[PDB]
């Protein structure tokens, strides 16, 4: 009954706005048995200490993984007001939360490389009335409702994807835009753990 980080080590990991999820509600986890397989670069945690996320029992451990270069590690936190934390991926401020920004090594295999890291720059809705515009702000993980328009990876430096909602609801072009960043020699990934405790129960526990 060990936690299954196995699916994390294959394929092309998805871009930031399309982050996949792994929810573990009953298993035993040895995280350093994972982080040993990467070259950890930035371990920043809020509402629980970075060392404390290694050994304590929770109710559900949620892990999100994606490709995110170190060039813009500044955008990814509750501090930023840019597009990474506002139209792409927002993690709940209510419950504890760790955020790792790691790197793939050469000696690791079957972590294939997406061509480039892209993210949703802007996500607005242009009302069915005259010209009124309302930005779309992503709530707790929400997949960024502009995600249907934007493909898995954005093609060029700045693109423009728009769709027309069927009339009522709501006649408003769920317009979105995407922007990319240059490839780095080693795949640089970002992981987000969102642990939450229980009423009087604890499953996920440091496999020691």
């Amino acid at each position, epitope marked *: 009954v060990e936690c299954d980080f196995s699916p994390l080590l294959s394929g092309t990991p998805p871009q930031v706005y399309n982050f996949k999820r792994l929810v573990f509600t009953n298993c035993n986890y040895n995280l350093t048995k994972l982080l040993s397989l990467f070259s950890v670069n930035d371990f920043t945690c809020s509402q629980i200490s970075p060392a404390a996320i290694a050994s304590n029992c929770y109710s559900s451990l949620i892990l999100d993984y994606f490709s995110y270069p170190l060039s813009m590690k500044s955008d990814l936190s509750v501090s930023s007001a840019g597009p990474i934390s506002q139209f792409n991926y927002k993690q709940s401020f209510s419950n504890p939360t760790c955020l790792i920004l790691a790197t793939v090594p050469h000696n690791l295999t079957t972590i294939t490389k997406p061509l480039k890291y892209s993210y949703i*720059n*802007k996500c*607005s809705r*242009l009302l069915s009335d005259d*010209r009124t515009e309302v930005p779309q702000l992503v709530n707790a993980n929400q997949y960024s409702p502009c995600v249907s328009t934007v493909p898995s990876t954005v093609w060029e430096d*700045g*693109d*423009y994807y728009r769709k027309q909602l069927s009339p009522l609801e709501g006649g408003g*072009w769920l*317009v979105a835009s995407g922007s990319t960043v240059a490839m780095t020699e080693q795949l640089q990934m970002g992981f987000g753990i969102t642990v939450q405790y229980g009423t009087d129960t604890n499953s996920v526990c440091p496999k020691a």
Partner: antibody
Framework: QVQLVQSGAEVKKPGSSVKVSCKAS????????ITWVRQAPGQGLEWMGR????????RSVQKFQGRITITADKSTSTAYMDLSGLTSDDTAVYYC?????????????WGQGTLVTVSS | EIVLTQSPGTLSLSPGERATLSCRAS???????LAWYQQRPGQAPRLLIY???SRATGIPDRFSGSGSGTDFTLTIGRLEPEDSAVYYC?????????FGQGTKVEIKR
């Protein structure tokens, strides 16, 4: 079906600045870019840049980069380029045209056109 | 960046004769990502074909669009004297979007 009405033949000097103003008759810049398109006299069209007033995003071709600023005022709904730092070789008729998005960036409705003539 | 060939250029054809315009691409482009435009003597170009297959809303379906991958052909089934114009094939397939050299149709009455 929005008719596009532009400005009028700026005569500038080799080393100047021209704000060509394309007007969105209707009051309505919807989810619709303006793409600008050169045409040297007796020659064949090029691409110069694109904007979306709905998002303020702008993009420019590589050759004309560092010399061109394409802006739009969504509220009064009027789009402009500003080809600063231009030589004598840019004496050409410039059109403004309506985008369609990502996979449908064909230029639907066009502007009348504004011949810039640049030599002292 | 894709440099592209066009048709022979100036064409002399009687009214009621089919006309073929070619658009070979030096670099491979998508099977359906090219748009044929028509500009009249002294005016702004008007969209004729989009996607190399579909027709622009309100364009008489003499102007058939076909071709895929490398060569794209615009075929005008019937010709009237109100077709005398310059036709450009633009490949909005690559980047930056490269307009065609352009072909001139002259209706021979």
């Amino acid at each position: 079906q929005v008719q596009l009405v532009q400005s009028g033949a700026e005569v500038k000097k080799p080393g100047s600045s021209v704000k060509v103003s394309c007007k969105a008759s209707g009051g309505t810049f919807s989810s619709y870019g303006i793409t600008w398109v050169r045409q040297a006299p007796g020659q064949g069209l090029e691409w110069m840049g694109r904007i979306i007033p709905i998002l303020g995003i702008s993009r420019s071709v590589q050759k004309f980069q560092g010399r061109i600023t394409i802006t739009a005022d969504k509220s009064t709904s009027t789009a402009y380029m500003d080809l600063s730092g231009l030589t004598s070789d840019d004496t050409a008729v410039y059109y403004c045209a309506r985008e369609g998005g990502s996979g449908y960036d064909f230029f639907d409705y066009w502007g009348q056109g504004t011949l810039v003539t640049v030599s002292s | 960046e894709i440099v592209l060939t066009q048709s022979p250029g100036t064409l002399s054809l009687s009214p009621g004769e089919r006309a073929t315009l070619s658009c070979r691409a030096s670099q491979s482009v998508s099977s359906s990502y090219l748009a044929w435009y028509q500009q009249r003597p002294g005016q702004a170009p008007r969209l004729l074909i989009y996607g190399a297959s579909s027709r622009a809303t309100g364009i008489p379906d003499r102007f058939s669009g076909s071709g895929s991958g490398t060569d794209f052909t615009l075929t005008i089934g019937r010709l009237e004297p109100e077709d005398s114009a310059v036709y450009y094939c633009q490949q909005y397939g690559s980047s930056p979007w490269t307009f065609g050299q352009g072909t001139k149709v002259e209706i021979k009455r």
